[PDB]
Amino acid sequence: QVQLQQSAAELARPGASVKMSCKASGYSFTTYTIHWVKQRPGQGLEWIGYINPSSGYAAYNQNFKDETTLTADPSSSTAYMELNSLTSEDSAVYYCAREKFYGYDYWGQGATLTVSSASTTPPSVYPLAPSMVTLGCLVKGYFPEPVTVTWNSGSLSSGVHTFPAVLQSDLYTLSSSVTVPSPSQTVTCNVAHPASSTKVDKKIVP
Amino acid sequence: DVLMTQIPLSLPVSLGDQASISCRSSQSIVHRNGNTYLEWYLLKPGQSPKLLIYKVSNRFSGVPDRFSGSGSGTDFTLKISRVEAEDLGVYYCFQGSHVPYTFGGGTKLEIRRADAAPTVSIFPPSSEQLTSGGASVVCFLNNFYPKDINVKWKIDGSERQNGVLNSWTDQDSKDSTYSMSSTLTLTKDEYERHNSYTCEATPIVKSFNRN
Amino acid sequence: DYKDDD
Ligand SMILES: [Cl-]
Ligand SMILES: [Cl-]
Ligand SMILES: [Cl-]
C-alpha cells in the first residue's frame, strides 16, 4: 500500500543542521515528486520545495533556499530534507507529500523539529485515579514535544481526551482522560516520547 | 508570489446545512500547459492534511459527493452540502501552478450545536508525584458546548489564580463538543498547608479534602 | 517544469 513514513521527532541545536527523511513505499518511487511542507502555529502551511527523483531536480521556495537542501535516493525509495543554520524559527511540524499531477494524495505523518539548546527529558507519568468512571494520565516534565498517549495499547479508543501540552519552565506537561463503564478488564495508559525513544505504561489503580 | 486569500476565517455551521469557502488568487494560476492546479485540503485534528479536490473541481477518490469545487480566473469556491460533524477542521486552498507554490491561510470549520454542560472531574496529586516533591491538582471539564467556559479554583474557600494553566481540545468530530483540562500546580510545601481544593465550571462544582 | 508533461 502507498505510505510515506517520516523519521521521528527530533531535537537540534541552534546553528546546527538536521536531516529529515521520508521513506516512500507501495509504488514506483521515481514516478512521483516529493514535496515538503512546514506547519508552525499561527503560520498555516508553507511550501518548502519538491524533489523529482526521476530527474534529480529540486525546486525551492526562495524564502527557504539558503537553509534547505533536498535530496532523494532511488535505491532506498527515500527523500531527504536537510535544514542548515537552524534557529528557533525552524521549530515546526514538517510533512512530506507525494505529487504527480493529481495533488498531494498521500502524506507522511509529520515530524516535529524543535531547535533548542535544552536537553531531552523523558516524561514522568502519574495516575489520575478516582454508571461512567473517568480515569486519567498526567504526563509531566518532558522535552521536546510530542508525546503520544494511548489506552490499552490502542484497544481502548472511545471516550478519550488528550489535551494539548503547556510549556512551563522549559518543560511540557499534558494530561489524558478516559471514560469507561463501571470483571478482569483493566485500564493502562501507554505514553511514547519519540524524541527520547522512551515508552511508559501506567496501569490505573483505585 | 501568488497570494491565496480565503474567506471566511471561521465557518461555524449547523449539521445538515450547506457551507462555502472562497479562495482568491492575487494573479492567474493557469499553468502554461492550460491546467489550473488549484487544490483543497482538510486538516482534521491530529491528522496530516487530506486531499479533497484537485484541478479546481475533481473530487479525490473516497471524498463524498457533498464536497464540490468550482471557479476560474482568480476566484475559487469549495462547497459542502449537508455538513456532517466529521467535516470539522481547517480547510486550505493551494495553488500548484506557479512556483513558489502557495497555500491559503486556512478556514476553520466548526459545528454549531446545542449547549451542553461539562462533566467535571477533580484529582488530587498522586502519591508518586508527591514523593518527588510536586503537587499538580487536575480538573477535567469534558464534552461541553460552546467552547468558552470559565473555570475557577478555590483553596479552603479563597479564590486561587496563581499556578493555574488551562488547555482546550479541538472540537470532537463525534458529538461536536469541547473538553478542557485545568491544572493547579503547587509546591508540595504549599499543597500540605491547605485542606479544601475546589474546581468550579461555569455552577458545576467538584472538590476534595486532603493536603 | 515537470508539469509540462501533464
Ligand atoms: Cl535560535
Ligand atoms: Cl498527484
Ligand atoms: Cl523535473
Short mmCIF file of N, CA and C in Angstrom, two decimals, chain A residues 12-91:
data_model
loop_
_atom_site.label_atom_id
_atom_site.label_comp_id
_atom_site.label_asym_id
_atom_site.label_seq_id
_atom_site.Cartn_x
_atom_site.Cartn_y
_atom_site.Cartn_z
N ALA A 12 17.30 19.57 17.69
CA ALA A 12 18.56 20.02 17.08
C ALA A 12 19.02 21.29 17.81
N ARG A 13 20.32 21.55 17.77
CA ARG A 13 20.88 22.74 18.47
C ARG A 13 20.79 23.94 17.53
N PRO A 14 20.70 25.18 18.06
CA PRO A 14 20.80 26.36 17.22
C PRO A 14 22.14 26.37 16.47
N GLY A 15 22.08 26.74 15.20
CA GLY A 15 23.26 26.81 14.35
C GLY A 15 23.62 25.49 13.68
N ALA A 16 23.05 24.37 14.15
CA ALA A 16 23.36 23.06 13.60
C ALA A 16 22.55 22.85 12.32
N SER A 17 22.73 21.65 11.75
CA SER A 17 21.93 21.12 10.65
C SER A 17 21.16 19.91 11.14
N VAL A 18 20.09 19.58 10.40
CA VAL A 18 19.32 18.36 10.66
C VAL A 18 18.89 17.78 9.32
N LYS A 19 18.85 16.45 9.25
CA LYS A 19 18.40 15.77 8.04
C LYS A 19 17.15 14.96 8.37
N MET A 20 16.05 15.29 7.72
CA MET A 20 14.78 14.64 7.93
C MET A 20 14.49 13.75 6.71
N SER A 21 13.90 12.59 6.96
CA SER A 21 13.69 11.62 5.89
C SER A 21 12.22 11.31 5.71
N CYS A 22 11.93 10.85 4.47
CA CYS A 22 10.59 10.41 4.05
C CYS A 22 10.77 9.17 3.19
N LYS A 23 10.47 8.00 3.78
CA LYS A 23 10.61 6.73 3.05
C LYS A 23 9.25 6.42 2.43
N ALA A 24 9.27 6.37 1.10
CA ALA A 24 8.08 6.13 0.27
C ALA A 24 8.05 4.63 -0.06
N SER A 25 6.90 4.03 0.18
CA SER A 25 6.74 2.65 -0.24
C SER A 25 5.40 2.51 -0.93
N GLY A 26 5.27 1.37 -1.65
CA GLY A 26 3.98 0.97 -2.19
C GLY A 26 3.77 1.40 -3.63
N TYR A 27 4.76 2.01 -4.30
CA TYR A 27 4.66 2.48 -5.66
C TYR A 27 6.06 2.58 -6.22
N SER A 28 6.18 2.87 -7.52
CA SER A 28 7.46 3.08 -8.16
C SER A 28 7.97 4.48 -7.80
N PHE A 29 9.01 4.51 -6.94
CA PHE A 29 9.43 5.76 -6.28
C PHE A 29 9.72 6.89 -7.26
N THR A 30 10.37 6.61 -8.39
CA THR A 30 10.78 7.66 -9.30
C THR A 30 9.63 8.33 -10.04
N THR A 31 8.41 7.78 -9.95
CA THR A 31 7.29 8.25 -10.76
C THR A 31 6.42 9.31 -10.12
N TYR A 32 6.80 9.70 -8.86
CA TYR A 32 6.14 10.83 -8.20
C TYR A 32 7.20 11.77 -7.58
N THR A 33 6.86 13.05 -7.60
CA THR A 33 7.67 14.04 -6.85
C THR A 33 7.32 13.87 -5.38
N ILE A 34 8.29 14.39 -4.55
CA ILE A 34 8.10 14.50 -3.09
C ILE A 34 8.28 15.98 -2.69
N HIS A 35 7.25 16.50 -2.07
CA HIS A 35 7.26 17.89 -1.60
C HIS A 35 7.29 17.88 -0.09
N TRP A 36 7.79 19.06 0.41
CA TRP A 36 7.94 19.32 1.85
C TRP A 36 7.17 20.58 2.23
N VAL A 37 6.45 20.45 3.34
CA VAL A 37 5.54 21.47 3.84
C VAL A 37 5.81 21.71 5.33
N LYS A 38 5.85 23.00 5.70
CA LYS A 38 6.10 23.42 7.10
C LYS A 38 4.81 23.89 7.73
N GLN A 39 4.51 23.38 8.93
CA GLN A 39 3.37 23.79 9.71
C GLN A 39 3.82 24.32 11.07
N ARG A 40 3.60 25.61 11.26
CA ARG A 40 4.01 26.26 12.53
C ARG A 40 2.79 27.02 13.04
N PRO A 41 2.44 26.91 14.34
CA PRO A 41 1.27 27.63 14.87
C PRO A 41 1.24 29.09 14.47
N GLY A 42 0.06 29.50 13.99
CA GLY A 42 -0.20 30.85 13.53
C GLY A 42 0.36 31.14 12.15
N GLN A 43 0.97 30.14 11.50
CA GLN A 43 1.62 30.38 10.21
C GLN A 43 1.06 29.43 9.16
N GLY A 44 -0.10 28.81 9.44
CA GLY A 44 -0.73 27.98 8.43
C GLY A 44 0.22 26.89 7.91
N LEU A 45 0.21 26.71 6.60
CA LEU A 45 1.05 25.76 5.87
C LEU A 45 1.91 26.54 4.88
N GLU A 46 3.20 26.19 4.79
CA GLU A 46 4.11 26.80 3.83
C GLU A 46 4.72 25.69 3.00
N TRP A 47 4.80 25.90 1.69
CA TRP A 47 5.52 25.01 0.80
C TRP A 47 7.02 25.30 0.80
N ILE A 48 7.85 24.31 1.05
CA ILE A 48 9.30 24.49 1.12
C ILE A 48 9.94 24.26 -0.24
N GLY A 49 9.51 23.17 -0.90
CA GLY A 49 10.17 22.76 -2.13
C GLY A 49 9.70 21.35 -2.54
N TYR A 50 10.24 20.88 -3.66
CA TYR A 50 9.99 19.48 -4.06
C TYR A 50 11.27 18.94 -4.64
N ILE A 51 11.35 17.59 -4.66
CA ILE A 51 12.35 16.92 -5.48
C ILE A 51 11.62 15.95 -6.43
N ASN A 52 12.14 15.92 -7.65
CA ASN A 52 11.66 14.96 -8.62
C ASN A 52 12.71 13.86 -8.75
N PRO A 53 12.51 12.68 -8.14
CA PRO A 53 13.54 11.65 -8.18
C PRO A 53 13.90 11.15 -9.57
N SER A 54 12.96 11.32 -10.51
CA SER A 54 13.20 10.89 -11.87
C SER A 54 14.33 11.67 -12.52
N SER A 55 14.32 12.99 -12.30
CA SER A 55 15.26 13.90 -12.96
C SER A 55 16.40 14.32 -12.03
N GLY A 56 16.21 14.22 -10.71
CA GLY A 56 17.14 14.77 -9.75
C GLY A 56 16.87 16.23 -9.41
N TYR A 57 15.93 16.91 -10.08
CA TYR A 57 15.75 18.33 -9.90
C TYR A 57 14.97 18.59 -8.61
N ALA A 58 15.49 19.52 -7.80
CA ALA A 58 14.73 20.07 -6.69
C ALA A 58 14.43 21.54 -6.94
N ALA A 59 13.19 21.91 -6.65
CA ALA A 59 12.73 23.28 -6.63
C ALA A 59 12.61 23.72 -5.19
N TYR A 60 12.90 25.00 -4.96
CA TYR A 60 12.92 25.59 -3.63
C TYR A 60 12.14 26.89 -3.61
N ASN A 61 11.37 27.07 -2.55
CA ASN A 61 10.85 28.37 -2.21
C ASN A 61 12.04 29.29 -1.87
N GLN A 62 12.11 30.47 -2.50
CA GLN A 62 13.22 31.41 -2.29
C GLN A 62 13.41 31.71 -0.81
N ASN A 63 12.31 31.73 -0.05
CA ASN A 63 12.39 32.01 1.39
C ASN A 63 13.12 30.93 2.20
N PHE A 64 13.26 29.72 1.64
CA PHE A 64 13.89 28.57 2.26
C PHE A 64 15.20 28.16 1.59
N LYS A 65 15.55 28.73 0.41
CA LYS A 65 16.61 28.14 -0.39
C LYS A 65 17.96 28.16 0.31
N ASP A 66 18.27 29.17 1.11
CA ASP A 66 19.60 29.26 1.70
C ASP A 66 19.74 28.33 2.91
N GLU A 67 18.63 27.80 3.42
CA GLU A 67 18.64 26.92 4.58
C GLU A 67 18.27 25.49 4.25
N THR A 68 17.95 25.20 2.99
CA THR A 68 17.33 23.91 2.62
C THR A 68 18.07 23.24 1.48
N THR A 69 18.29 21.93 1.62
CA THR A 69 18.79 21.10 0.52
C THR A 69 17.92 19.84 0.49
N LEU A 70 17.31 19.58 -0.69
CA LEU A 70 16.50 18.39 -0.92
C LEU A 70 17.30 17.37 -1.73
N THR A 71 17.19 16.11 -1.32
CA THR A 71 17.84 15.01 -2.00
C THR A 71 16.86 13.83 -2.06
N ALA A 72 17.25 12.87 -2.89
CA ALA A 72 16.49 11.64 -2.98
C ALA A 72 17.40 10.50 -3.42
N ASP A 73 17.19 9.34 -2.79
CA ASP A 73 17.96 8.14 -3.05
C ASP A 73 17.00 7.10 -3.63
N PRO A 74 16.92 6.95 -4.97
CA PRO A 74 16.03 5.96 -5.57
C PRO A 74 16.23 4.55 -5.05
N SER A 75 17.49 4.15 -4.80
CA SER A 75 17.77 2.79 -4.35
C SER A 75 17.07 2.44 -3.04
N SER A 76 16.84 3.43 -2.15
CA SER A 76 16.18 3.21 -0.88
C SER A 76 14.78 3.81 -0.82
N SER A 77 14.28 4.36 -1.92
CA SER A 77 12.97 4.99 -2.01
C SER A 77 12.81 6.01 -0.89
N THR A 78 13.86 6.81 -0.66
CA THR A 78 13.82 7.79 0.42
C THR A 78 14.18 9.19 -0.08
N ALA A 79 13.37 10.17 0.33
CA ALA A 79 13.64 11.58 0.08
C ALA A 79 14.11 12.19 1.42
N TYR A 80 15.02 13.16 1.30
CA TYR A 80 15.57 13.82 2.48
C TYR A 80 15.44 15.33 2.31
N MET A 81 15.27 15.97 3.48
CA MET A 81 15.35 17.42 3.57
C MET A 81 16.38 17.78 4.65
N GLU A 82 17.42 18.50 4.23
CA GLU A 82 18.41 18.95 5.20
C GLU A 82 18.21 20.43 5.41
N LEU A 83 18.06 20.80 6.67
CA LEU A 83 17.95 22.20 7.08
C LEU A 83 19.25 22.60 7.78
N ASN A 84 19.83 23.72 7.33
CA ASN A 84 21.07 24.23 7.93
C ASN A 84 20.82 25.55 8.69
N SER A 85 21.84 25.90 9.47
CA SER A 85 21.88 27.18 10.17
C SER A 85 20.62 27.34 11.01
N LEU A 86 20.28 26.33 11.81
CA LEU A 86 18.97 26.28 12.42
C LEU A 86 18.76 27.39 13.45
N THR A 87 17.56 27.90 13.50
CA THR A 87 17.13 28.86 14.52
C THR A 87 15.83 28.42 15.13
N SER A 88 15.35 29.08 16.17
CA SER A 88 14.05 28.75 16.71
C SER A 88 12.92 29.01 15.69
N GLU A 89 13.09 29.85 14.64
CA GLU A 89 12.06 29.96 13.59
C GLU A 89 11.85 28.63 12.88
N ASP A 90 12.82 27.74 12.96
CA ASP A 90 12.67 26.47 12.23
C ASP A 90 11.91 25.46 13.05
N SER A 91 11.58 25.66 14.31
CA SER A 91 10.81 24.70 15.09
C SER A 91 9.40 24.68 14.51
#
